[PDB]
């Protein structure tokens, strides 16, 4: 409950909405780059989720927002078998057509989690201890 | 009889091509669906003449010296119209005329300018072709009265620039041709969030400067979607080529491979600690 | 030993369907044209190269459904903090597979409610 200027205090962590464009990968290093460390945010409970959509609404709902979640994929996609039952032995996607790193949906009201590409340009929010 | 009547099971095609005419033959089958009217001498045509044929789905009016279209009667079940290669100098209005129109090929005419309400009652138009006319500049809100639009051709004209928000509203646009024009920049925010599978933008002299940074950014992000127009070739020479779009149409200077040194980026928040 | 209108490549008959349907009922056609039929399933670039060389005469530069679905769900998803996911608050969306009719036969995430052309396959 004791936190930095340009930041905000909730339970278990300091929070700050970072008003810059960056990739998912680069935003992780910019989260660790804040002196008190940490990563992108993490959402588990209802009151916690309801809390965070209100902080980005103070930044006037600019666009979609990165968060810490990411699909950990073996290869490219996330399905074992085709419809005829045969196994996925071949992949022909593009890294722009990959949706691994998730994002706060700006439409639904920053209440949900949507995967997109990781090299895209969005705002982020680091989650840092006191 | 008067023409070649094709008896395929699906539709009642009739071919009256290249038979030297100046108007329609009097007695056609009533169940005619396709009618071919190419290479004739039709310098003015009245759509009302087709109104007996309640079964018509298709009509080719290409390559037959046409210069004036009497936009007159309602063609309910018409879906495709070909008017390519003729000698029109402006474009008719068809709001009430034919709702069910999906294909509209107006290529290789002599158009030069577009109206405002240039198309209405065309919520069912899927494809549209302006290939090779003499257009320079497009009217705002152009593609708005056509939402279902999948394809769209603007190749080879003397296009210079485009309205931002032109594409906006086209959730089913998949193909998009702007080759061999004289495009020079794209407005920031032009394609938006829509995925565009096919897009040909070669043959244009581009001014690579700070203003084209949105376009390069798009070309980086969409390089698997940039192709080049080829007609009689194997599909295997139909592969993705982002390098084709070139600064000042120089083969040695792509656009996505452009540094843009000196262009101001959008004071660190986390550095002032 | 393929039926009358089905092109053949390594023991599977193939038929291009130019009737645009959604992903789901694309299967429904396949499965009722022959017992055992499904959407197409690609397992090599050697295979895809044929499909594209078949389809493109019929569909100049189109989009074809292929037999995949929900391609971002079955993977594990880990937080940045490394904490696990107790409860889920997804923006649940639809995601089916569209393959182009160009050279590499690129792969595209399409809405499954959107209608597009498709191609059935089956083993004899």
- What Rg, from alpha-carbon coordinates, does chain C have? 17
Q: What is the rounded distance in angstroms from the CA atom of residue B234 to the CA atom of residue B25? A: 41
Residues A123/A62, Cβ–Cβ less than 8 Å = yes
DSSP string, C10-79: SSEEEEEEEEEE-HHHHHHHHHHHSTT-EE-----HHHHHHHHHHHHHHSTT-EEEEEEE-TBTSSEEE-
Query: Which residue has tokens 């927002």?
Result: A65
Resolution (angstroms) equals 3.3
Half-sphere exposure in the Cβ direction for B84 (13 Å, CA):
15
Reference B79, options B49, B26, B35; nearest CA is: B35
Chain C adjacent subunits, 3+ CB pairs under 8 A: A, B
The structure's method of determination equals X-ray
Query: Which distant-in-sequence residues (6+ apart) come within 8 Å of C66 by Cβ?
Result: C39, C40, C41, C42, C97, C98, C99, C107, C119
Q: Enter the tokens of residue C3.
A: 């039926």
Reference A83, options B55, C53, C28; nearest CA is: C28
Q: What is the rounded distance in angstroms from the CA atom of residue C13 to the CA atom of residue B27? A: 46
Q: What is the Cα A16 distance to its own chain's centre?
A: 14
Residues A41/A12, Cβ–Cβ less than 8 Å = no
User: What is the number of CB-based contacts under 8 A between chain A and chain C?
Assistant: 125
State whether C87 and A92 contact (CB < 8 Å). Answer: no
A102 vs C contacts (CB less than 8 Å)? 77
DSSP string, A13-29: EEEEEEEEEE-HHHHHH
Residues C108/B197, Cβ–Cβ less than 8 Å = yes
Residues B154/B179, Cβ–Cβ less than 8 Å = no
Interface of A with C in 61-90 (CB under 8 A): 67-74, 77-80, 82-84, 86, 88-90
A109: left (phi over 0), alpha (psi -120 to 50) or beta: left
B32-50 as b/e: b if 16+ CB within 10 A? bbbbbbbbbebeebebeeb
Per DSSP, which regions of chain B are E strands? 4-5, 13-15, 34-36, 45-46, 58-60, 69-70, 80-82, 103-105, 127-129, 199-200, 226-227
Residues A68/C75, Cβ–Cβ less than 8 Å = no
Per DSSP, which regions of B10-133 are E strands? 13-15, 34-36, 45-46, 58-60, 69-70, 80-82, 103-105, 127-129
State whether B222 and A96 contact (CB < 8 Å). Answer: yes
C104 vs B contacts (CB less than 8 Å)? 224, 239-240
Cross-strand partners of B186: none
Cα angle vertex C64, ends C58, C68, to 5°?
Answer: 150
Tell whether B269 is within 8 A of chain A (Cβ): yes
Long-range pairs for A115-120: beta carbons < 8 A, 24 or more residues apart: A115/A71, A115/C72, A116/A64, A118/A23, A118/A24, A118/A25, A118/A70, A119/A23, A119/A24, A119/A25, A119/A95, A120/A23, A120/A24
CB atoms within 10 A of CB B228: 17
Which residue in the set C74, C79, C87 is minimally distant from A68, CB to CB?
C79
Which residue in the set A18, A94, A96 is minimally distant from B269, CB to CB?
A18
Q: What is the rounded distance in angstroms from the CA atom of residue A55 to the CA atom of residue A15? A: 9
Cβ neighbourhood burial of B27 (10 Å; 0-12, 13-18, 19+)? exposed
Residue B113, domain extent:
1-273
Q: What is the rounded distance in angstroms from the CA atom of residue B263 to the CA atom of residue B260? A: 6
User: What is the number of CB-based contacts under 8 A between chain B and chain C?
Assistant: 35
Of chain C, the end-to-end C-alpha distance in Å amounts to: 8
Which residue in the set B224, B234, B237 is minimally distant from C106, CB to CB?
B224
Q: Enter the tokens of residue A4.
A: 């930095």
Tell whether C102 is within 8 A of chain B (Cβ): yes
Q: What is the rounded distance in angstroms from the CA atom of residue A74 to the CA atom of residue A82? A: 17
Query: Which distant-in-sequence residues (6+ apart) come within 8 Å of B259 by Cβ?
Result: none
Domain positions in chain A = 1-130
Domain positions in chain C = 1-124
Domain count along chain B: 1
Query: Which distant-in-sequence residues (6+ apart) come within 8 Å of A29 by Cβ?
Result: none
Q: What is the rounded distance in angstroms from the CA atom of residue C96 to the CA atom of residue C75? A: 16
The residue of chain C with its CA nearest to that of A104 is: C91
Chain A adjacent subunits, 3+ CB pairs under 8 A: B, C
């Amino acid at each position: 409950v004791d936190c930095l200027p340009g930041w905000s205090a909730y339970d278990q962590s300091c929070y700050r909405v970072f008003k810059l464009l960056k990739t998912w990968d680069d935003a992780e290093k910019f989260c660790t780059e804040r002196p008190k460390g940490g990563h992108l945010v993490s959402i588990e409970s209802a009151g916690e989720r309801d809390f965070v959509a209100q902080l980005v609404s103070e930044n006037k709902q600019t666009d979609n927002v990165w968060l810490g979640l990411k699909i950990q994929s073996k290869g490219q996609q996330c399905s074992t078998e085709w419809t005829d039952g045969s196994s996925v032995s071949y992949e022909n996607f593009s890294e722009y057509q990959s949706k691994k790193c998730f994002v706060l949906e700006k439409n639904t009201g920053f209440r949900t989690w949507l995967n997109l590409n990781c090299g895209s340009e969005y705002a982020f929010v680091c989650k840092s201890p006191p | 009889p008067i023409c070649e009547v094709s008896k395929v099971a699906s539709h009642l095609e009739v071919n009256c091509d290249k038979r030297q005419l100046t108007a329609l033959p009097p007695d056609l089958p009533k169940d005619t669906t396709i009618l071919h009217l190419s290479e004739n001498l039709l310098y003015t045509f009245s759509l009302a003449t087709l109104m007996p044929y309640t079964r018509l789905t298709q009509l080719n009016l290409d390559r037959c010296e046409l210069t004036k279209l009497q936009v007159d009667g309602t063609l309910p079940v018409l879906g495709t119209l070909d008017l390519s290669h003729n000698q029109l100098q402006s474009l008719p209005l068809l709001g009430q005329t034919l709702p069910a129109l999906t294909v509209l090929d107006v290529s290789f005419n002599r158009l030069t300018s577009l109206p405002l309400g240039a198309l209405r009652g065309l919520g069912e138009l899927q494809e549209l072709y302006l290939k090779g006319n003499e257009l320079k500049t497009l009217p705002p809100g152009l593609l708005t009265p056509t939402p279902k639009l999948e394809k769209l051709s603007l190749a080879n004209n003397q296009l210079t620039e485009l309205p931002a928000g032109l594409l906006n509203g086209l959730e089913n646009l998949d193909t998009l041709l702007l080759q061999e024009n004289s495009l020079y920049t794209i407005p920031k925010g032009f394609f938006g969030s829509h995925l565009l599978p096919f897009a040909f933008l070669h043959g244009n002299p581009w001014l690579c400067n700070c203003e084209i940074l949105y376009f390069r950014r798009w070309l980086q992000d969409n390089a698997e979607n940039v192709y080049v127009w080829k007609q009689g070739v194997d599909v295997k020479a139909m592969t993705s080529n982002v390098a084709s779009v070139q600064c000042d149409n120089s083969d040695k200077f792509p656009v996505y491979k452009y540094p843009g040194k000196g262009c101001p980026t959008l004071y660190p928040e986390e550095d002032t600690e | 030993c393929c039926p009358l209108r089905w092109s053949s490549y390594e023991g599977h008959c193939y038929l291009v369907v130019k009737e645009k349907k959604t992903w789901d009922d694309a299967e429904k056609f396949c499965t009722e044209q022959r017992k055992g039929g499904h959407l197409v399933s690609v397992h090599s670039r050697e295979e895809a190269d044929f499909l594209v060389h078949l389809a493109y005469p019929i569909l100049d530069l189109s989009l074809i459904w292929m037999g995949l679905s929900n391609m971002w769900n079955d993977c594990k998803r880990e937080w940045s903090d490394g904490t696990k996911l107790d409860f889920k608050a997804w923006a649940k969306t639809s995601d089916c597979l569209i393959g182009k009719t160009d050279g590499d036969n690129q792969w595209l995430n399409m809405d499954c409610s959107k209608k597009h052309y498709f191609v059935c396959k089956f083993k004899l």
